[PDB]
Scaffold this active site. Structure first.
Site, PDB file in Angstrom:
ATOM      1  N   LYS A   1       7.656   0.649   2.446  1.00 33.35           N
ATOM      2  CA  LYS A   1       8.390  -0.172   1.489  1.00 33.35           C
ATOM      3  C   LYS A   1       9.837   0.289   1.332  1.00 33.35           C
ATOM      4  O   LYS A   1      10.778  -0.492   1.467  1.00 33.35           O
ATOM      5  CB  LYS A   1       7.692  -0.135   0.124  1.00 33.35           C
ATOM      6  CG  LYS A   1       6.286  -0.734   0.132  1.00 33.35           C
ATOM      7  CD  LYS A   1       5.570  -0.630  -1.208  1.00 33.35           C
ATOM      8  CE  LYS A   1       4.849   0.723  -1.375  1.00 33.35           C
ATOM      9  NZ  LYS A   1       5.734   1.894  -1.527  1.00 33.35           N
TER      10      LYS A   1
ATOM     11  N   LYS B   1       9.643   9.555  -7.731  1.00 32.64           N
ATOM     12  CA  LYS B   1      10.339  10.437  -6.779  1.00 32.64           C
ATOM     13  C   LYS B   1      11.785  10.001  -6.454  1.00 32.64           C
ATOM     14  O   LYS B   1      12.529  10.744  -5.825  1.00 32.64           O
ATOM     15  CB  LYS B   1       9.536  10.642  -5.489  1.00 32.64           C
ATOM     16  CG  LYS B   1       9.272   9.489  -4.566  1.00 32.64           C
ATOM     17  CD  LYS B   1       8.230  10.007  -3.535  1.00 32.64           C
ATOM     18  CE  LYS B   1       8.012   9.041  -2.388  1.00 32.64           C
ATOM     19  NZ  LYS B   1       7.728   7.676  -2.904  1.00 32.64           N
TER      20      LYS B   1
ATOM     21  N   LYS C   1       0.829  -1.208   0.000  1.00 33.65           N
ATOM     22  CA  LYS C   1       0.000   0.000   0.000  1.00 33.65           C
ATOM     23  C   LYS C   1       0.863   1.257   0.000  1.00 33.65           C
ATOM     24  O   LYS C   1       1.961   1.252   0.539  1.00 33.65           O
ATOM     25  CB  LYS C   1      -0.912  -0.001   1.242  1.00 33.65           C
ATOM     26  CG  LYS C   1      -1.898   1.158   1.363  1.00 33.65           C
ATOM     27  CD  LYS C   1      -3.063   1.019   0.416  1.00 33.65           C
ATOM     28  CE  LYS C   1      -4.093   2.130   0.620  1.00 33.65           C
ATOM     29  NZ  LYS C   1      -5.207   2.067  -0.394  1.00 33.65           N
TER      30      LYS C   1
ATOM     31  N   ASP D   1       0.590   2.680  -5.499  1.00 31.09           N
ATOM     32  CA  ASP D   1      -0.507   2.331  -6.400  1.00 31.09           C
ATOM     33  C   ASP D   1       0.095   1.914  -7.749  1.00 31.09           C
ATOM     34  O   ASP D   1       0.760   2.710  -8.422  1.00 31.09           O
ATOM     35  CB  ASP D   1      -1.465   3.510  -6.574  1.00 31.09           C
ATOM     36  CG  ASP D   1      -2.082   3.960  -5.263  1.00 31.09           C
ATOM     37  OD1 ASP D   1      -2.133   3.146  -4.316  1.00 31.09           O
ATOM     38  OD2 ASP D   1      -2.511   5.130  -5.176  1.00 31.09           O
TER      39      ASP D   1
END
Ligand code: ACP
Ligand code: ACP
Ligand code: ICS
Ligand code: CLF
Ligand code: SF4
Ligand code: FE2
Ligand code: MG
Ligand code: MG
Lengths: 262, 476, 522, 272
Positions: free
Chosen positions: A15, A41, A10, A129
């Site tokens: 992560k 990013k 999620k 996502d």
């Protein structure tokens, strides 16, 4: 010889933090590891390299003209523990196509032979996502074969683990890519470890480790470091070593069975 | 025969998997000229079955290749990777008068030529820079269109913004067109997106202006792209009839003719499929009536001249009967020379959205019969117009497959096929005379009285050529 | 009006007084056209050195490019294998364009399918289209093999060809052993030659990657030939003829010569000839693999050196005398066969032709363009002839290729006035032939627009177009020509010296003005 | 005038929840509102409709063949307070292109006259990571003019609030889009409100409202409705009313000034 792993979960779950802290411990154990960041990013290697690693793949290609003109020497750097770092890069929010940037970078690394030094592990850090084919580039055939899904005890995190597992199935059926397990990055919810074990069971996988919520993680992050490098003696630092030891010894690689919400 | 043809349909369809069979069955029919609701007998304008070799193109071909591309004094940017713009460069023969590269640009290929960085970082900055270089290198251009190819629509580049900003900075009409190739199911949606863009960005520039001098005889030719000079050959008839043609859309077309079209009394619509959109809109907004006409062959043309002249006073009708009397000996001699050579011959057609019904008239004027016809991308209102023009128990096909068309011809055995460049060489190898009915095999015009002469000569030269008796070696 | 005995088509029909008068009225009344005065001044300006400087400052605009996109090459590659259907995963607009493009160049049918990905397949992916499409194609057109490539849109969204095909097979849309090789062919990278490289590599990997265990290099005693993106039928034929003539066992990998030249005998053949599946499977057993056009077969070369373990020779494209020689010695070295008397004589007949025509070719100045290997082969031959290339353009070229071509140029007195351009298009080239006028252009049909422009300045500035390359749409059957080997070199020499003589006669055909030099004997 | 706002923020920060609750309170005030979900999963309108949002535009279009075949009536539903709901839809994770799904959907609403009502407000609920042009479709010209960024006292949210602003600047310049403010969705970090007020200042905006973390929200969520509807008397229901009037009465519209990763860290350090 070489193990390729992809980290999903999620958005906002931890992560990139979990991945980097693991790799730090892994390198500290004497493993040769490469981290491949697959997020526009480009923050996935920010803690292994203190302060900067200026050069993303897409950036250097845009500047150099084309990806084909770009040499491996320009984008791959080493940080804490000899850990090799490369970043896909991509556009700023709201323009261009970050997915294609990932396809191009992963294709670049393959064409230039980045996988064949003497590497034990490759880690792909993917964003939350997974909106398109580009961001499943790390789990195609001859890429990652093990996937670990970061979750927690709250409703939304688990819901995401399940939807990522469905996205995996088409890549798992037609290929060798397998789910390795769920890593629980705690949010301090009630009976949380049991809860994630239950979810893991219904999927057909395990929970490899329960990672406690400990603000040393964020304090080390503010210093542009892993907990392993920031404070080797801390309790959280031993947690990542435990997680690290388990990933080395994992043999459980399954095709997950997605559940209906009831 | 009606039952025999129905049987031919069921046999051909036996090769397909069940999903493709149930669908391809809806697009093949045995005609009834009595039927006026084509929905009952056939369906069209649906998506092509994957892997079946449709002859259909995309939205971009429909918009850039067809509607926009002919407009000669604008610059049309193929926005995206280099392929699209390159395969369509000077492929369609939309004739124009001009000094190419200076004040006219039709045969030229302008593109942003996307590389990988432009995909990933987006191309609005490059597009802006591109418009500056254009305005530097082609200062006599009178406007610019931006024709999006497939990836511009995926990544979400903001070409409307770049068009408003750059257009203001330069006081230049810049028309952003989202004719992404994956939109729609064929060329057809490209027409529509092309017409809405004309509407939104060009057609209104002179709404407040009343300087143009208008007469009760002003008309526009809408939906003629001047293939081989078709429009120039039509235009001459309208004007000998005393009408004044202010506009031609879009063959040999200028951006000023388009802006002056709202000042006409009547819109003459040749290609219904590609421009019925703007024609309905101009009737709704400016009160201008529109009417469909056919200038293929003498019968249709004579009938069309009379129908159009009837919309005006008796002076124009008088001039109508004059034009007719003038070209009567010319089209009668063409008939006397070429019909005896073509009488009784059977032809199968397959073209885009207008000609499969429109040219039937010309063939009959030479004593030929249309035994089969179909479209790449018509809608049911085209097939409404089609069925009364075809004979009973003739075959109708829509988005026909390479395989279907191949097998239909094997059974029906026509003397002549008229279709496109992709079809051409298949059927020559079969020993079947073939005429290109998009490009006119680099000949034409075929529109009007002057074209019919070239039309008669082309159908006879090909069908009766000595090469067609040579396909079998004497010894086998 | 038409006289029924002599019907006029668009030319010269629209030169009749009534059409001309009508067009004059169109222009004056509604066109709001710039005055001729201005048009002529703008035209003149675009032929100058100052316009060239601006033109060469371009960074974002491309005008009249000299290249196409990757899947066009893939399709051509796929066409070269037995009973193989090119299949392009993505938008159907592309396929209509690829076929038309090759139809016009080859004047032949061109077979290729799409899986018609629309707007919902854009946002959901093309998994279904790939399932239904592979099934429908196999059932309807019955190929032995389907070779899958991609349009640009399938590439933006990252459609995983490998997975889509494996699920198609796993779910019973096509049988598992039915060969479905693939290659990602993104149009926004490289060009159509890159697409050929990518497609060939997919197929070669497909047939040889698993089973390298039982392969021994040299065990089938044959030499692999990879031609690359090639559009002269004669080029496939001449390589095959020279090898057979030497007694060399060979295997041509991707051979479309038959299927692009089927006979008109009463039947349509969708498939004909081509490289068999068994030939590809057996390829790693060959003595070695020769790449005919190395500058766009770099991906193929790595797989063949890396997986097959062949010492792929460093050979230039076999065009002109030195490089045909070099090709023949190396094929001789690999295979053990000496060079036969028949090829040696042919070499000396091309030399004889060079000696016969040298006085007319000498110092002649050419601008030219095309694909990287073609161009460098053509440049090398122009130098061997005593000609001076002046403008060398290769739009899909790269910095390394440019370095090699600059070295060839500098090795010869005849290259002193030449400059190589990569990344530049036909609008750039147009400026060059106005500011630094050569005698001729050598390029494809798109160059006729330049010739029209140079003529409009004046008959003394006209630069004639010599049609060699791809695509050629405005002459018939030039695709049957040859550019490789001695045979190709003879044809090119003859095309060149006779363009020179054809032009000279035109400049000397003026009665009692230039015809003192209208010689019977040249 | 009709006011269009787009809600952005870090993955998982609480956008959809805050958005639907903000909108319920707006409807509760008598405003006419539409919600447009720009997220591939269909959860942006689920608390207003009382069940999952089954019919997204892309799904209906694929079923009908093409979006050109699709009716507006087939995708536009009304729930609590008469609020209009529509979902873009898109793929499940890892295939296709969710960006195009949004572009397609927004264009559909425009063509079918979805804006040609007497609507008082349109809210676009957007994905966490704005990875491509499609997810900025809600902030082009004639779309959103006000942007609100939902954040928290946590590191990840503020980095994200700052990164999104970088993306906003490009559209603010060529359009009328402006950053309206920050909505702080509490994570109970220490001195959380001061930190977001401070962050808001360096960018050039305000902190519009502080939404406390309240487990009543999650109870209502399980009941598939907003807190405004789940418990109109609740203290949290009042928090959303407060936020509502502040957005309603908001006039502060700025082009944000993104700060450097250094400034963001020294800020966290100054408060923690
Ligand atoms: N075990 C833990 N205890 C406390 N805080 C933690 C933690 N793990 C991660 N965090 C914090 O939560 C934030 C998110 O971490 P990270 O950036 O790795 O998440 P992520 O990569 O899933 C977000 P995205 O999906 O956008 O890439 C960081 O500020 C991190 O320091
Ligand atoms: N103020 C609050 N108090 C308590 N719980 C809250 C809350 N705001 C949100 N939540 C809960 O947190 C969860 C996440 O909410 P929401 O779905 O709105 O986040 P989000 O939209 O940023 C996730 P995504 O990135 O997937 O769209 C939901 O269960 C919601 O009920
Ligand atoms: S525009 Fe259409 S396919 Fe009406 S897209 Fe096509 S120059 Fe055809 S049957 Mo090519 S609807 Fe014109 C046509 Fe007809 S390009 Fe030409 S010949 S009368
Ligand atoms: S439907 Fe273009 S030809 Fe294609 S692979 Fe992309 S560059 Fe090459 Fe239509 S708009 Fe064009 S032609 Fe297709 S891509 Fe789309
Ligand atoms: S969704 Fe994925 S593929 Fe589609 S545009 Fe955005 S980033 Fe590129
Ligand atoms: Fe032929
Ligand atoms: Mg991350
Ligand atoms: Mg949400």
């Amino acid at each position: 010889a070489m193990r390729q792993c992809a980290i999903y979960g999620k958005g906002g779950i931890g992560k990139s933090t979990t991945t980097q802290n693991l790799v730090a411990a892994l390198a500290e154990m004497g493993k040769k590891v490469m981290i491949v960041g697959c997020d526009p990013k480009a923050d996935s290697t920010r803690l292994i390299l203190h302060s900067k690693a200026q050069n993303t793949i897409m950036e250097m290609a845009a500047e150099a003209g084309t990806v084909e003109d770009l040499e491996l020497e320009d984008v791959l750097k080493a940080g804490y523990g000899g850990v090799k770092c490369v970043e896909s890069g991509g556009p700023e929010p709201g323009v261009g196509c970050a997915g294609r940037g990932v396809i191009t970078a992963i294709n670049f690394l393959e064409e230039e032979g980045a996988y064949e030094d003497d590497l034990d592990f490759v880690f792909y850090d993917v964003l939350g996502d997974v909106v398109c084919g580009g961001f499943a580039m790390p789990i195609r055939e001859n890429k990652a074969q093990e996937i670990y899904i970061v979750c927690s005890g709250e409703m939304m995190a688990m819901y995401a683990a399940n939807n990522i597992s469905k996205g995996i199935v088409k890549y798992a059926n037609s290929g060798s890519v397998r789910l390795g397990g769920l890593i629980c990055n705690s949010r301090n919810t009630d009976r949380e470890d049991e809860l994630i074990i239950a979810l893991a069971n219904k999927l057909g996988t395990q929970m490899i480790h329960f990672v406690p919520r400990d603000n040393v993680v964020q304090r080390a992050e503010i210093r542009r470091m892993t907990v392993i490098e920031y404070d080797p003696k801390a309790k959280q630092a031993d947690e990542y070593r435990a997680l690290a030891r388990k990933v080395v010894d994992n043999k459980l690689l399954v095709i997950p069975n997605p559940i209906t919400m009831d | 025969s009606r039952e025999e043809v129905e049987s031919l349909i069921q046999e051909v369809l036996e090769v397909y998997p069940e999903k493709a069979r149930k669908d391809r069955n809806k697009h093949l029919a045995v005609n009834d000229p009595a039927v006026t609701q084509s929905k009952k007998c056939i369906i069209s304008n649906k998506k092509s079955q994957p892997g079946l070799m449709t002859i259909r193109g995309c939205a971009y071909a429909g918009s850039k290749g067809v509607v926009w591309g002919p407009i000669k004094d604008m610059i049309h940017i193929s926005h995206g990777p280099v392929g699209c713009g390159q395969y369509s460069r000077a492929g369609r023969r939309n004739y124009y008068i001009g000094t190419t590269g200076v004040n006219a640009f039709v045969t030229m290929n302008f593109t942003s030529d996307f590389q990988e960085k432009d995909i990933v970082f987006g191309g609005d900055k490059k597009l802006a820079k591109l418009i500056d270089e254009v305005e530097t290198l082609f200062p006599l251009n009178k406007g610019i269109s931006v024709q999006s190819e497939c990836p511009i629509g995926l990544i979400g580049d903001d070409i409307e913004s770049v068009s408003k900003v750059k257009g203001a900075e330069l006081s230049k009409t810049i028309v952003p067109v989202r004719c992404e190739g994956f939109r729609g199911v064929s060329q057809s949606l490209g027409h529509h997106i092309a017409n809405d863009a004309v509407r939104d960005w060009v057609l209104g520039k002179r709404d407040e202006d009343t300087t143009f001098a208008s007469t009760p005889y002003d008309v526009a030719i809408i939906g003629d792209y001047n293939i081989g000079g078709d429009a120039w050959s039509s235009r001459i008839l309208l004007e000998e009839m005393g009408l004044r043609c202010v506009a031609q859309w879009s063959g040999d077309g200028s951006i000023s003719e388009i802006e002056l079209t709202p000042k006409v009394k009547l819109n003459l619509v040749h290609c219904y499929r590609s421009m019925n959109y703007i024609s309905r809109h101009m009737e709704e907004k400016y009160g201008i009536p529109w009417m469909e006409y056919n200038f293929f062959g003498p019968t249709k043309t004579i009938e069309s001249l009379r129908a159009i002249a009837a919309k005006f006073d008796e002076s124009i009708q008088k001039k109508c009967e004059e034009v007719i009397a003038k070209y009567k000996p010319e089209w009668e001699a063409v008939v006397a020379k070429y019909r005896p050579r073509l009488e009784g011959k059977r032809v199968m057609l397959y073209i885009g959205g207008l000609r499969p019904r429109h040219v039937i008239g010309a063939y009959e004027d030479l004593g030929m019969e249309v035994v089969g016809t179909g479209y790449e991308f018509a809608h049911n209102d085209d097939y409404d117009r089609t069925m009364k023009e075809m004979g009973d128990s003739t075959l109708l096909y829509d988005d026909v497959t390479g395989y279907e068309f191949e097998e239909f011809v094997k059974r029906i055995k026509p003397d002549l096929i008229g279709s496109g460049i992709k079809e051409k060489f298949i059927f020559q190898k079969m020993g079947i005379p073939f005429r290109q009915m998009h490009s006119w095999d680099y000949s034409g015009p075929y529109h009007g009285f002057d074209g019919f002469a070239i039309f008669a000569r082309d159908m006879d030269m090909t069908l009766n050529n000595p090469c067609w008796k040579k396909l079998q070696a004497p010894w086998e | 009006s038409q006289q029924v005995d002599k019907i006029k088509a668009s030319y010269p029909l629209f030169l009749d007084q009534d059409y001309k008068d009508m067009l004059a009225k169109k222009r004056d009344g509604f066109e709001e056209k710039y005055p001729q005065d201005k048009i002529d001044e703008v035209f003149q300006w675009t032929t100058t050195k100052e316009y060239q400087e601006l033109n060469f400052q371009r960074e974002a605009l491309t005008v009249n490019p000299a290249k196409a996109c990757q899947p066009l090459g893939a399709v051509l590659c796929a066409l070269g294998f037995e009973k193989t259907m090119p299949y392009v995963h993505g938008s159907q607009g592309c396929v209509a364009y690829f076929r038309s493009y090759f139809n016009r160049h080859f004047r032949e049918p061109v077979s290729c399918v799409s899986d018609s990905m629309t707007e919902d397949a854009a946002v959901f992916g093309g998994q279904q289209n790939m399932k239904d499409g592979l099934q429908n194609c196999k059932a309807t057109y019955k190929p032995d093999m389907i070779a899958v490539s991609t349009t640009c849109m399938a590439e933006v969204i990252g459609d995983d060809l490998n997975a889509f095909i494996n699920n198609s097979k796993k779910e019973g849309f096509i049988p598992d052993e039915f060969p479905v090789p693939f290659a990602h062919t993104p149009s926004f990278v490289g060009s159509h030659v890159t697409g050929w490289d990518n497609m060939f590599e997919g197929i070669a990997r497909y047939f040889t990657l698993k089973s390298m265990d039982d392969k021994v290099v040299g065990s089938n005693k044959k030499i692999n030939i990879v031609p690359g993106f090639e559009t002269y039928l004669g080029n496939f034929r001449v390589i095959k003829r020279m090898l057979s003539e030497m007694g060399v066992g060979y295997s041509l990998l991707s051979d479309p010569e038959e299927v692009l030249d089927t006979p008109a005998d009463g039947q349509f053949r969708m498939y004909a000839g081509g490289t068999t599946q068994e030939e590809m499977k057996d390829a790693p057993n060959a003595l070695n693999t020769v790449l005919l056009q190395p500058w766009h077969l770099e991906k193929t070369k790595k797989f063949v050196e890396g997986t097959w373990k062949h010492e792929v020779p460093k050979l230039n494209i076999p065009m002109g005398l030195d490089w045909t020689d070099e090709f023949l010695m190396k094929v001789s070295e690999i295979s053990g066969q000496p060079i036969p008397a028949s090829l040696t004589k042919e070499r000396g007949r091309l030399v004889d032709m060079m000696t016969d025509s040298h006085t007319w070719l000498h110092g002649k100045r050419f601008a030219l363009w095309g694909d990287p290997d073609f161009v460098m082969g053509l440049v090398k031959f122009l130098l061997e002839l005593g000609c001076e290339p002046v403008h060398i353009l290769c739009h899909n070229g790269n910095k390394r290729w440019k370095k090699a071509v600059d070295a060839i140029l500098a090795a010869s007195p005849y290259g002193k006035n030449a400059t190589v351009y990569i990344g530049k298009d036909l609008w750039h080239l147009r400026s060059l032939v106005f500011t630094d006028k050569p005698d001729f252009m050598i390029g494809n049909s798109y160059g006729k627009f330049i010739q029209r422009d140079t003529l409009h300045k004046g008959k003394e500035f006209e630069v004639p177009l010599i049609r060699i390359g791809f695509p050629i749409f405005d002459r018939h059957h030039l695709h049957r020509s040859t550019t490789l080997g001695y045979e190709g070199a003879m044809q090119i020499l003859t095309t060149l010296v006779n363009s020179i003589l054809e032009r000279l006669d035109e400049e000397t055909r003026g009665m009692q003005a230039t015809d003192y030099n209208h010689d019977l004997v040249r």
